[PDB]
Predict the structure of Bile salt hydrolase.
Amino acid sequence: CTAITLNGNSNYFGRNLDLDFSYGEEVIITPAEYEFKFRKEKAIKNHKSLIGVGIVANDYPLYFDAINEDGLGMAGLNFPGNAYYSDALENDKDNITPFEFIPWILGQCSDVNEARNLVEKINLINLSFSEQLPLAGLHWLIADREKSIVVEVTKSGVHIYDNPIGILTNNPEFNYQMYNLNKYRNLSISTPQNTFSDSVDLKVDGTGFGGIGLPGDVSPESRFVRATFSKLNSSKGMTVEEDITQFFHILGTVEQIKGVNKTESGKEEYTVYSNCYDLDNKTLYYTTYENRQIVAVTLNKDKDGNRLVTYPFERKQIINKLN
Amino acid sequence: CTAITLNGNSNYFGRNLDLDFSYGEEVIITPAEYEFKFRKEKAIKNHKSLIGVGIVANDYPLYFDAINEDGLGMAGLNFPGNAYYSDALENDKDNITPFEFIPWILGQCSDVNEARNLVEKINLINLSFSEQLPLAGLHWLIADREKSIVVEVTKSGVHIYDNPIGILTNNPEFNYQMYNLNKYRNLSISTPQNTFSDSVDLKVDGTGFGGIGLPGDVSPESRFVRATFSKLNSSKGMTVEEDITQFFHILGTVEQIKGVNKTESGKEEYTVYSNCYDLDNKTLYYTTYENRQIVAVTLNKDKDGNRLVTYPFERKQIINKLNLERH
Ligand SMILES: C[C@H](CCC(=O)NCC(=O)O)[C@H]1CC[C@H]2[C@@H]3[C@H](O)C[C@@H]4C[C@H](O)CC[C@]4(C)[C@H]3C[C@H](O)[C@]12C
Ligand SMILES: C[C@H](CCC(=O)NCC(=O)O)[C@H]1CC[C@H]2[C@@H]3[C@H](O)C[C@@H]4C[C@H](O)CC[C@]4(C)[C@H]3C[C@H](O)[C@]12C
Ligand SMILES: C[C@H](CCC(=O)O)[C@H]1CC[C@H]2[C@@H]3[C@H](O)C[C@@H]4C[C@H](O)CC[C@]4(C)[C@H]3C[C@H](O)[C@]12C
């Protein structure tokens, strides 16, 4: 997985979902008055309305990622081994399951400051959704229009990091991911000077020599570095459309194609979908592995009602045939 | 630039065009009876029909890349400094300009073997199209459904290489690009075993460790290696449509986004367009930097037309909007 933010004409947030199969994920809109029930806390009957991507099981929206009506985003990314969920409930904490974590935060908080304050009081508890959908290790990027934070709950406790670059992938932990960037300081967007030695006439026969050293594989660390370099140096767009276009190009730099990353089961890991949320305009844009054309759906300020509203992903290549 | 081939349910050929501006590119169909004029040779009034991408200037199709009615393709890629075009005309060879080279080959040749025999005997001459559109050094990938060759005309002469992998970018010369792959034999699609040392317990905390060492920058050598690794290992598709989808994913691994590659002029080099020709079905599919939706145009047999048929590129993001906003 790779999740990024982007600040331009509007403000954006989104992710690649990398996996060896599709869950049958879809757009899910949770209306303000859909009752959020929690396994160990009091139900929230009236909350901020959400739009996001995930599956519906037992009439409950299991979000992979989502934004709310205030333009606060949240995405769960794989964090295998490092994620620790506690078996013990705490009287002085809000005892919340990892699958309830997106509704808990996005239902109640309008920005990152309010998200941080609420995450500070949390205890992520080890209870699965069902026997069919057991818990997996996750960590979270939470982002609004100004900034973002990373939430990683491990054996040592609940860690919240300011994310200065708006990038997140998978393992290792976030301080290791940020430290890993330091050795790439010498990378450049331009042709560098010959600092190797002035006593040899080193020739440049092509553009893009500045980037030499940037890792190209699809391991989580290499994708963290490549996404950071691509995002931070990406050119500013003139419009919101140019920003969204540029956003999908940035996610395309760390996309996983079928064939290059075979898992232990022998299945091919690939970028199942890519999405971009316009946070100021409350609009989800997305693409799938099977369809390059961007699909858009706006969360409109309507008192929607009671029930989950879904728009299924269409996994067929929509080609404009000119004949 | 990166040009690749792919063999799946059908057989494919295509490229990324990497540049710091757009020429106003368009689909150009040249019918069989469009008279190809040549600066230093006799005009050809009847030939094979082409479909490809480029610009029209003075009613002449200036192809960036194209295919013909037999599914033979040809693409010109940037080859700065290494290309040598002759300043002298030969009395016993066809004196053809670089901008005439795609029509010269694709107009007359049905497969790679015929293209090679014609390329062997050519004299590429140092003549510009016009003052507005001067020559720049190129090298070519020529591909059919079976195989592909690389043409590099340098000071040492006309060099034709069998391309065993169906990959081409820019400098260096092709033997250097192919030799450069040898150091990456250790790369893998799966989590490798700890051969570093069994005296230390090295942990794997994520997928994709096998690829570590694959270069990720947009220099021509790094794109040559990354495109080769991505193309050769890419999964087989069930249908032709899945192959095309997969083809655009392969070109996307070596795409240049605006901002990461600042040229000498200070402008940003970017993938202006990507295309995929279905060679068996003679159909051009393409995308642009500004538009993610694939656009398709088929070459139809039309043995009597003598005028170029053109479809300009849409440089606007065509989004499938499910509902309207309230602004
Ligand atoms: C060749 C065409 C003119 C004929 C034509 O329009 N053919 C395509 C068609 O008919 O669709 C012209 C029109 C605009 C020109 C471009 C613009 O002036 C901008 C820019 C100016 C530079 O001096 C040289 C490169 C170029 C991209 C120009 C190259 C070329 O000089 C262009 C692209
Ligand atoms: C993307 C590169 C850019 C090459 C360049 O100018 N490099 C200078 C450099 O790197 O120093 C190539 C690929 C196909 C080329 C075009 C095609 O061959 C068709 C046509 C051929 C004419 O001889 C010159 C103009 C042009 C439009 C060419 C302009 C330009 O030549 C193109 C678009
Ligand atoms: C597996 C996948 C990505 C990581 C990877 O490559 O393993 C992760 C990221 C978000 C996850 C899903 C979301 O967190 C929503 C659900 C949460 C439930 O606790 C498990 C099922 C559930 C439906 C998850 C399945 C799976 O673990 C997802 C889809």
